[PDB]
Amino acid sequence: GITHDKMYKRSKTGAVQGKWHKKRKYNLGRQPANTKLIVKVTSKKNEGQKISTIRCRGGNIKRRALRLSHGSFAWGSADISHKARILQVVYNSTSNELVRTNTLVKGCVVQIDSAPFKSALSNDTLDKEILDQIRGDHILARISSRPGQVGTADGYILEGPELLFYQKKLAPK
């Protein structure tokens, strides 16, 4: 199947290499499974959180997320963390196609529901930039985990000079 072997690759000088052997199980690669965010929970409940375990080397099960709807999102400064529905993927550094299809990959900037974090509004002097996002019901966060390997979409709420970079990217629209 898919091979991560460098035998197919050309040398540093750009020379052709020689195929001395046939493909091996150890150098197997698997088809990528893009975790699609379920943004259609209202439309249908048939598409539920679907995570699939796969058999790997050494019988080490790896959980591959096919569809996900929620994640544990952590506001590090306030130390407030709650399970939150992910509303949409807005900004992925690798491509805009992943943002349109709403694939959940590590580091994709996601908008999360602020209904769990609504309590934080009561305490002021807790980062105005996070607080006005909380009032609006959408908070800028980033997935901090790999959904394909872990099977979960844990993250953290964008804060400090990171929040500014990604809010500037999504500022015109």
Partner: protein, 151 residues
């Protein structure tokens, strides 16, 4: 800050540390590899981020530590080193002067010109041709001739 597609942060330092009371928590990670090597003041105090820098990034210098001349610094944050070595044959009791180009990673902290004596330490595969990181730089007078040098 808009040309860059992604925000480059040090994984070790939390972006929320850049809020009030900057003095309370360190905003820069500067690990010191040992083997009698010292973190430069440029690494300790550097705006650069580099996840493959051996002083401020998530890499470990382990294995062989070699020293060689700079052949080219043209590649971005990468350098080609010309390791010069003698090979001895028996049929003729003479030697053969031989050269090997090894690809290293220049940290942004180190400034190098083609000719400087660099010290390179083995690291995890960083690219197809890069398994080394520059941990010391020795400057040269630019008009330094060439000289076959085993370093």
């Amino acid at each position: 800050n808009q040309h860059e597609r992604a925000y480059h942060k040090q994984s070790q330092i939390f972006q929320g540390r850049f809020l009030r009371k900057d003095n309370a928590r360190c905003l820069r990670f500067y690990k010191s590899i040992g083997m009698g090597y010292h973190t430069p003041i440029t690494a300790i105090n550097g705006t650069y981020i580099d996840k493959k820098c051996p002083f401020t990034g998530n890499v470990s210098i382990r294995g062989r530590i070699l020293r060689g001349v700079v052949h080219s610094a043209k590649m971005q944050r990468s350098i080609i080193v010309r390791r010069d070595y003698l090979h001895f044959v028996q049929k003729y009791k003479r030697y053969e002067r031989r050269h090997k180009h090894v690809a290293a990673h220049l940290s942004p902290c180190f400034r190098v010109k083609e000719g400087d004596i660099v010290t390179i330490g083995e690291c995890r595969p960083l690219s197809k041709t890069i398994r080394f990181n520059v941990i010391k730089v020795e400057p040269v007078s630019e008009a330094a001739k060439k000289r076959f040098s085993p370093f």
